[PDB]
Design a protein around this ligand. Sequence first.
Ligand SMILES: Nc1ncnc2c1ncn2[C@@H]1O[C@H](COP(=O)(O)OP(=O)(O)OP(=O)(O)O)[C@@H](O)[C@H]1O
Lengths: 806, 48, 107, 144
Amino acid sequence: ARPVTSPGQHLLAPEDVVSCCLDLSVPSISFRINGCPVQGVFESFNLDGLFFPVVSFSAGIKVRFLLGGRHGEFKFLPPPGYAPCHEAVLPRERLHLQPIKEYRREGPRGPHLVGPSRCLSHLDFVPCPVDTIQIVLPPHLERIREKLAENIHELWALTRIEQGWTYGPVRDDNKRLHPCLVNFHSLPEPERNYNLQMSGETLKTLLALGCHVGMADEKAEDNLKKTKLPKTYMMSNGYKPAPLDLSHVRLTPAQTTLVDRLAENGHNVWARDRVAQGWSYSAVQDIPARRNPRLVPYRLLDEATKRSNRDSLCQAVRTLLGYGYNIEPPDQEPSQVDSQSRGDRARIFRAEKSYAVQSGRWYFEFEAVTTGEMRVGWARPELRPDVELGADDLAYVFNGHRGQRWHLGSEPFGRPWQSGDVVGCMIDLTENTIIFTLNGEVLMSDSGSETAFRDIEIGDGFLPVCSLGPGQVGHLNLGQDVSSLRFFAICGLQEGFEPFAINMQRPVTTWFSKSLPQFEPVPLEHPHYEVARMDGTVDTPPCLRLTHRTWGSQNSLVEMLFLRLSLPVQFHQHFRCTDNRDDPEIILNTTTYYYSVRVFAGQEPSCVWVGWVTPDYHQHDMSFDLSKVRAVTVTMGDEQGNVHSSLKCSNCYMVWGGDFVSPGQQGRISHTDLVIGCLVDLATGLMTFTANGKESNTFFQVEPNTKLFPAVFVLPTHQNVVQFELGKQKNIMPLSAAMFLSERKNPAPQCPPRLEVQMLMPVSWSRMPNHFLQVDTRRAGERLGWAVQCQEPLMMMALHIPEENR
Amino acid sequence: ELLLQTNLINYVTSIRPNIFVGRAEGSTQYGKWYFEVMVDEVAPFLTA
Amino acid sequence: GVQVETISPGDGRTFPKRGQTCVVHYTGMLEDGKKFDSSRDRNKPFKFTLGKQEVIRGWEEGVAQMSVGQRAKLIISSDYAYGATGHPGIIPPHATLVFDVELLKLE
Amino acid sequence: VGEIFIYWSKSHNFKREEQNFVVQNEINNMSFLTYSVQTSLIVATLKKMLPIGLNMCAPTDQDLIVLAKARYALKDTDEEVREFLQNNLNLQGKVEGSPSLRWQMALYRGVPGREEDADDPEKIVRRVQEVSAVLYHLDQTEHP
Ligand SMILES: Nc1ncnc2c1ncn2[C@@H]1O[C@H](COP(=O)(O)OP(=O)(O)OP(=O)(O)O)[C@@H](O)[C@H]1O
């Protein structure tokens, strides 16, 4: 929190109006309080995503979002050039207030568990039509091309009069009369040129698609019977639309699919052209301002516009098909999206470990509100959060999307579920069996067995578990209210199964797999990574060396690895105002500390980043590079500008190993280790780096009280990857002296047991709260805006780990 | 700094409208956006 | 010395005078942001008479600089709060204290 | 169905004839369900109808069911088992004894009609006897 000056400063209080302005061009974020400027700005921040307005609060608040238009009238005029936020609502959405990244919701019969939500990306608004300029129309195609440009206008005009449109000498919205309504030659040549270029473009588009068109009969193409025009149909100008008429032509599912692809490319080409001309999207059309309600990539368009475009294109596809030219939808090439990592994508909810059952007959229910990827069953207490449910021996589950039983792999079982279906899960620890029912009917394997699994070793017991994929919703009923169970009586009660939470006076606590990367000690038995603690010799300091166990061999795992040291160095509360043997006074009075990383020969320096991270680094980026580091500048100025301070904030201070590769050695595997040394002055906030002795040009400045962990990000390319060297330099203290109070004046390098290497893990188990804030969101009116209310207080007892600031 | 620390803290939640704006080369989205929030009631110390 | 930064405005006229009993609700933190005291945790306003040297010097000056109903942040240096000795087991030696005080009433 | 299954278990010619017929005609019991005692239609139908029988008995009668199975294992006749149930109809499971019976009885009384029944001791001595006999013979059939 950085104090910011404004007239009559005060913590947000009733009748306060906060205006927020975001200029993505700078980029910059600025505020106004009750119309007065706030003398501070955020700027130069990351732009790799989409921004949304947000309010955060605790209980005891009531606020209203004003977004302009009919969604809250502004109390102050937006600064010149800024657009009301209500205009940014996408075509196929309706404006409303929503929570962010919710894993749980309320529902008619109880709490609903929610899987991850699929989000758009800033690149989803870039139209990307296929190249269609290198394409050269076949001669036969070019002959139909001229007809396509004008005939398409013909069908349009027939539709336009059907719209009630009549030619307008002057366009008028009340008139519904179009100046551009007339004959293709009558229509202005520049507008006509866009039409003619479009008809040729469709043929080139097909060639790019790869569908092949050649005319089986030229005579059939010659035979045309364009529909006549009624007099009411004719425009004020008197021009009559004469689309050529072709009742005979028919489509095929592949051909219809190919027409949907054709409509996408056309719209994307148009969108790219309009963007180049300088248009943008807006929920409310504004022709003078060059804002269009349809200027989005075809994928995000509303269904009505999609249907209209598909109709036009399918009419045009048919005219070519009827001429005799053969359209053959291009072969389909197998494609995989893999939007995210499956091992870390689906959200897993399990009961708390203390509820594990080691005997008896237990039953619970899972209602599938959606019908997508969802798994439900029983898991062992040591279930891992980064593995798909049932992909290993730690869970026996049923996947009702297609019908499968998962345990150490997938096997066909049961039938797919439908929305509202209830899956009953039974475990019988006397017979050592697991049974699944769907709406009370026991699901059976192909062999006809009525037990999904059998001969199950009890071990440490079992817990109810479920897994929800992106965009999925389930309802887990453990049976505290036996009356709430919907099919327990039908199947399970007589067979002798008890609801899981039958005699629990409190609801069963659940944990979920949280996808927030966290640093954890490298496991002692990690199959791929091994850390060795090397003692300091007469010429070598203490070291922590990383080796890739399974390098080269098959099944080797090669991915970005984010490592840090378990303990931080802390900068002083107050910064200082403005032989080769150590000199005792200098070394006892220095505030500069040092540590190095040795990158072994064979490890590519271009695949290594060395430096520091703050306690809040959480990026498990598999394509990491320094441009992805979070950064933002906070600039505080005076009441007439006059910048007074400009602080850069980040969570990763590193140098790239590639900056120290000589251009000559570049492109050749080096035979020398690269040692990168990091120096921090804890009393001034300065951080500098050296590469093989030479001082580099990279330097950073941090603020007092900052906590920094030594860090290394590496993509292994060798069996010996890197080595943390906890040594010293001349007149510079080792890291142990900064980390440990008792060693504050000890210049001998040390590596105590607490200091160890930690790696970034993508998923962790997290306890879901038993109660949640009750937030009421509604629309107060067309002038008041969108109201958010939260009145009932809620508190938790937090446990804080000091060194990790978590 | 050595023992684990404890304290009672408030639960906090966030609310947004479904409005998403960004920038990319060749994007169809406008660049400058504006909105407001009016505070009707605020209890400074509903809890400790 | 003590620096006073308003958080919420007060009445603007009624200030404590020597010999008066100020009633306050406060939360104390160390400069690094660690909480060590709060009257709201005990749910009982803290009362102290101005000029009787009952509280630290930083408090004596800062609260006197406030008006009734006002909430303010007080930043107090070590020499004004506890100096070198500190508060054994609570406040380290040579610690700057940040307080979030609210002057509820005067009596 | 339970009476037919009891006859099947008691007699030995019945089992031989069933096994023969199935083997000779190559009748796939799995075809109907979706050669062996498990596959026997006679026992499969009984096991599929059994829930309707267990539904007749209130949970309070589970103790009498165990007792009746215990005599029938002593090889007593139906009139005998009925008499013992009639006499020591006071060995019924008590509700306050264990919470499980509490929620079981909650469900049972919630089901309409079931609350109205179980009020005449003849009903109990009949239903317990029947269900206990069926469960006994099921136990023997499944057991080696
Ligand atoms: N959103 C769009 N997607 C694809 N093609 C388009 C789109 N808008 C315009 N076109 C092309 O421009 C032609 C415009 O000709 P037409 O006379 O039918 O429209 P208009 O009345 O001039 O309207 P507009 O103002 O939308 O250009 C369309 O036939 C089509 O070729």
